[PDB]
Amino acid sequence: YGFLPELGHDCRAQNRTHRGESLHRYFMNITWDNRDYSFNEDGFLVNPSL
Amino acid sequence: KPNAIQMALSVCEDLISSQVYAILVSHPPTPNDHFTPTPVSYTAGFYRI
């Protein structure tokens, strides 16, 4: 996108839940500190370091 | 209430402040699915109400 697409974050004004589905797909390739932090669709880590 | 997040705060302010032992909920007249039951089950379930 090249910008910051802020949503209707106002909690006391309206409600929106349809756009939240297209948010998980961004968190599949997170890596830091020589460790893998990739999240699966469900919400937790898939390949952690236990 | 018509909105969502205001329902969550209204439940504890008015209902559990009167020392309730159980809560009854009903589907809203408007044809919207699972709107009323989620805020109630997340605030009453905090105290196992």
From Swiss-Prot, chain A:
Which disorder is recorded? Answer: Developmental and epileptic encephalopathy 46: A form of epileptic encephalopathy, a heterogeneous group of severe early-onset epilepsies characterized by refractory seizures, neurodevelopmental impairment, and poor prognosis. Development is normal prior to seizure onset, after which cognitive and motor delays become apparent.
| Part of the full-length chain shown | 338 to 387 of 1336
- Specify the protein name: Glutamate receptor ionotropic, NMDA 2D
- The source's domain of life comes to Eukaryota
Q: Which organism is it from?
A: Homo sapiens
Q: How does it assemble?
A: Heterotetramer. Forms heterotetrameric channels composed of two GluN1/zeta subunits (GRIN1), and two identical GluN2/epsilon subunits (GRIN2A, GRIN2B, GRIN2C or GRIN2D) or GluN3 subunits (GRIN3A or GRIN3B) (in vitro). In vivo, the subunit composition may depend on the expression levels of the different subunits. Interacts with PDZ domains of PATJ and DLG4.
**Gene designation:** GRIN2D
Any notes on this protein's domains? A hydrophobic region that gives rise to the prediction of a transmembrane span does not cross the membrane, but is part of a discontinuously helical region that dips into the membrane and is probably part of the pore and of the selectivity filter.
By sequence similarity, the record places it as follows: Belongs to the glutamate-gated ion channel (TC 1.A.10.1) family. NR2D/GRIN2D subfamily.
The protein's location, in the record's own words, is:
Cell membrane; Postsynaptic cell membrane
UniProt-annotated glycosylation sites, renumbered to this chain: 15, 29, 47
Tell me the lineage of the source organism. Answer: Eukaryota, Metazoa, Chordata, Craniata, Vertebrata
Q: What does this protein do?
A: Component of N-methyl-D-aspartate (NMDA) receptors (NMDARs) that function as heterotetrameric, ligand-gated cation channels with high calcium permeability and voltage-dependent block by Mg(2+). Participates in synaptic plasticity for learning and memory formation. Channel activation requires binding of the neurotransmitter L-glutamate to the GluN2 subunit, glycine or D-serine binding to the GluN1 subunit, plus membrane depolarization to eliminate channel inhibition by Mg(2+). NMDARs mediate simultaneously the potasium efflux and the influx of calcium and sodium.
From Swiss-Prot, chain B:
Q: Any idea where this protein resides?
A: Cell membrane; Postsynaptic cell membrane; Postsynaptic density membrane; Synaptic cell membrane
The post-translation modification note in this UniProt entry reads: NMDA is probably regulated by C-terminal phosphorylation of an isoform of GRIN1 by PKC. Its phosphorylated state is influenced by the formation of the NMDAR-PPP2CB complex and the NMDAR channel activity.
Task: Provide the assembly information.
Answer: Heterotetramer; the NMDAR subunits are modular and harbor tiered domains that function in concert to regulate opening and closing of the cation-selective ion channel pore. Forms heterotetrameric channels composed of two GluN1/zeta subunits (GRIN1), and two identical GluN2/epsilon subunits (GRIN2A, GRIN2B, GRIN2C or GRIN2D) or GluN3 subunits (GRIN3A or GRIN3B) (in vitro). Can also form heterotetrameric channels that contain at least two GluN1 subunits and at least two different GluN2 subunits (or a combination of one GluN2 and one GluN3 subunits) (in vitro).
Recorded family membership:
Belongs to the glutamate-gated ion channel (TC 1.A.10.1) family. NR1/GRIN1 subfamily.
Q: What does this protein do?
A: Component of N-methyl-D-aspartate (NMDA) receptors (NMDARs) that function as heterotetrameric, ligand-gated cation channels with high calcium permeability and voltage-dependent block by Mg(2+). NMDARs participate in synaptic plasticity for learning and memory formation by contributing to the long-term potentiation (LTP). Channel activation requires binding of the neurotransmitter L-glutamate to the GluN2 subunit, glycine or D-serine binding to the GluN1 subunit, plus membrane depolarization to eliminate channel inhibition by Mg(2+).
Give the disease association. Answer: Neurodevelopmental disorder with or without hyperkinetic movements and seizures, autosomal dominant: An autosomal dominant neurodevelopmental disorder characterized by severe intellectual disability and developmental delay, absent speech, muscular hypotonia, dyskinesia, and hyperkinetic movements. Cortical blindness, cerebral atrophy, and seizures are present in some patients. Neurodevelopmental disorder with or without hyperkinetic movements and seizures, autosomal recessive: An autosomal recessive neurodevelopmental disorder characterized by severe intellectual disability and psychomotor developmental delay, involuntary and stereotypic movements, spasticity, and inability to walk without support. Intractable seizures manifest in some patients.
The name of this protein is Glutamate receptor ionotropic, NMDA 1
Give the source species.
Homo sapiens (Human)
Query: In the record, what lineage is assigned to the organism producing the protein?
Result: Eukaryota, Metazoa, Chordata, Craniata, Vertebrata
Positions spanned in the full protein: 68 to 116 of 938
